[PDB]
Write a protein that binds this ligand. Structure first.
Ligand SMILES: O=C1CC[C@@H](NC(=O)c2cscn2)CN1
Lengths: 245, 179
C-alpha cells in the first residue's frame, strides 16, 4: 500500500478517521453506515496489498533470485496477475468515490451516500464474468499450490533461505505464502457479510436500499457459480480418478 | 516459537467472528465491532512453551461446500462453536459440523466452545427463547455434546466481558502441541 491510502485508513473506524467536529454533524444512523463502508474499503486496501506481496515480494523474488523449474512459480501463484488487476481496479473505484466526497479544505472528512451502484457494476457484466472465471480457476488450484510450496520448502535449501529471508520482517507476520493463498480464497466470502451490514444502515434513501439489495443478490449469484465450478486439481492424479469423481 | 494453525467452525449466529476479534485485540471494541476477521498470528506461551498461533474464521463460507474445506488444510486445532443463547446452534454440531471436521481434519483435536455465556442469565434472552419452547443451553448439555462428538474438551466463554477467552486459546494451544 502507498502511504497516502494507509494513513487515510489507519483508524479503527470512520468515526475515528474523520475530525471530531465533522462527526458531530451527522446522525447516529449515518455514522453506522459510514463505519461499515470504511471497513469494506479498508479490507479491500489490505486485500490488494496481500496480492502485491504475492506478485512483487514472492513471485518476482523467486524469478529474479532462484533457479526453479519452468511452471513452478505459476503453480505456486496461480492467477495472481488477473486477481491483482480485478481488485486494484475495484479499489481504485472505491477510493475515487471517497475522494469525490471529501469536503473542500479536508483530506479526511467525507460521507459516501451512493455505494450501491458501484457494487452493482463490480458484480455484474464483464467484470463479474472475469471474477467468476478467475476465482473458479484460483480456488481449484488452491490445494496444488499449498502442496507444491510444502515440497519446495522441505527439499530446496535456496528456496527455504529465500522464504525465511523475505518473511522475517514483523510486517510479514500474517503473510507467509500459504497464509496469502487462504487470505485470497476467503476474500470473496467476506463481501455478503459487509454488504448486508451496509444495507442494514442504508434505509434512509430508498434508491440506495434497492441498489444494495440488488448488489447483495449479485454477489451471492457470483459465489454460488464459483462454488459450483470448483474441483481440486491434484498433481499426479490419473484420468480414472477424475472420471470416477 | 513453533507455528500452529487454529480454525473456528460453527453456525453464523455462534459468535465465532467476535471471539477471534476479542482474543486478537485483548479488548472488546469500544467504538466499532468489525463485521469480518482477516487472520492473525497470536504470540502465546502456555505451560512454558512459546507458540505462534495462526487464527482463521470460516464466517461467510457456511453456504459454500466447495469453498469452505479450503480453510482446513494443515489445521492443528479446531474450535467448534455454538451460542449458549441458541440451542439450535448446538443441535447442528453432531451431524453437520462434526462429520465435516473429522473428514477434512482427521485426528485433529476439537474443543467444543459455548459462546455468549453472559446471556445464560439474561432476562431478554430467557423471554425470547420461551416463545419457541426453549431455554439457554445448560453447562451439562454442552459437556454431554462434547463427550458425544469425541471432543478433546468442553469450555465456555464470553467475548463481551472477555471471561474465559484467554483460557480457550491457551487450551487450544496445548491441544495443538499434543502428539
Ligand atoms: O499476540 C497476541 C494478541 C493478544 C493476546 N490476547 C490475550 O491474551 C487475550 C486474553 S483475553 C482476550 N485476549 C494474545 N496474543
Amino acid at each position: 500500500s502507498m502511504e497516502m491510502d494507509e494513513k487515510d485508513f489507519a483508524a479503527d473506524s470512520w468515526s475515528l478517521a474523520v475530525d471530531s467536529s465533522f462527526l458531530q454533524q451527522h446522525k447516529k444512523e449515518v455514522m453506522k453506515q459510514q463505519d461499515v463502508i470504511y471497513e469494506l474499503i479498508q479490507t479491500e486496501l489490505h486485500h490488494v496489498r496481500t496480492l502485491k506481496i504475492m506478485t512483487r515480494l514472492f513471485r518476482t523474488g523467486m524469478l529474479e533470485e532462484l533457479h526453479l523449474e519452468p511452471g513452478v512459480v505459476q503453480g505456486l501463484f496461480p492467477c495472481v496477475d488477473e486477481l491483482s488487476d480485478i481488485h486494484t481496479r475495484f479499489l481504485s473505484q472505491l477510493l475515487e468515490r471517497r475522494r469525490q466526497a471529501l469536503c473542500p479544505g479536508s483530506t479526511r472528512n467525507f460521507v459516501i451516500h451512493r455505494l450501491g451502484d458501484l457494487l452493482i457494476s463490480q458484480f455484474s457484466g464483464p467484470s463479474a464474468e472475469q471474477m467468476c472465471k478467475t476465482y473458479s480457476e484460483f480456488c481449484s488450484r488452491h490445494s496444488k499450490a499449498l502442496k507444491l510450496y510444502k515440497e519446495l520448502y522441505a527439499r530446496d535449501k535456496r528456496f527455504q533461505q529465500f522464504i525465511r529471508k523475505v518473511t522475517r520482517p514483523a510486517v510479514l507476520k500474517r503473510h507467509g505464502v500459504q497464509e496469502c493463498i487462504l487470505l485470497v480464497t476467503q476474500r470473496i466470502t467476506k463481501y455478503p457479510l459487509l454488504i448486508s451490514r451496509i444495507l442494514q444502515h442504508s434505509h434512509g434513501i430508498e434508491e440506495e436500499r434497492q441498489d444494495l439489495t440488488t448488489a447483495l443478490g449479485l454477489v451471492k449469484e457470483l459465489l454460488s457459480n464459483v462454488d459450483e465450478g470448483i474441483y481440486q486439481l491434484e498433481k499426479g492424479a490419473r484420468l480414472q480418478e477424475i472420471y470416477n469423481r | 516459537a513453533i507455528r500452529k494453525k487454529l480454525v473456528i467452525v460453527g453456525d453464523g449466529a455462534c459468535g465465532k467472528t467476535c471471539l477471534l476479534i476479542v482474543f486478537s485485540k485483548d479488548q472488546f471494541p469500544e467504538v466499532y465491532v468489525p463485521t469480518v476477521f482477516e487472520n492473525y498470528v497470536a504470540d502465546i506461551e502456555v505451560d512454558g512453551k512459546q507458540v505462534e498461533l495462526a487464527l482463521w474464521d470460516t464466517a461467510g463460507q457456511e453456504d459454500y461446500d466447495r469453498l469452505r474445506p479450503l480453510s482446513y488444510p494443515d489445521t492443528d486445532v479446531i474450535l467448534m462453536c455454538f451460542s449458549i443463547d441458541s440451542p439450535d446452534s448446538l443441535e447442528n454440531i453432531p451431524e453437520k459440523w462434526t462429520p465435516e471436521v473429522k473428514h477434512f481434519c482427521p485426528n485433529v483435536p476439537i474443543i467444543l466452545v459455548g459462546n455468549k455465556k453472559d446471556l445464560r442469565n439474561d432476562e431478554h434472552t430467557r423471554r425470547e427463547l420461551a416463545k419457541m419452547k426453549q431455554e439457554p443451553v445448560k453447562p451439562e448439555e454442552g459437556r454431554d455434546m462434547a463427550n458425544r462428538i469425541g471432543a478433546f474438551g468442553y469450555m465456555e466463554c464470553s467475548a463481551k466481558t472477555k471471561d474465559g477467552v484467554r483460557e480457550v486459546f491457551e487450551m487450544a494451544t496445548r491441544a495443538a502441541l499434543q502428539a
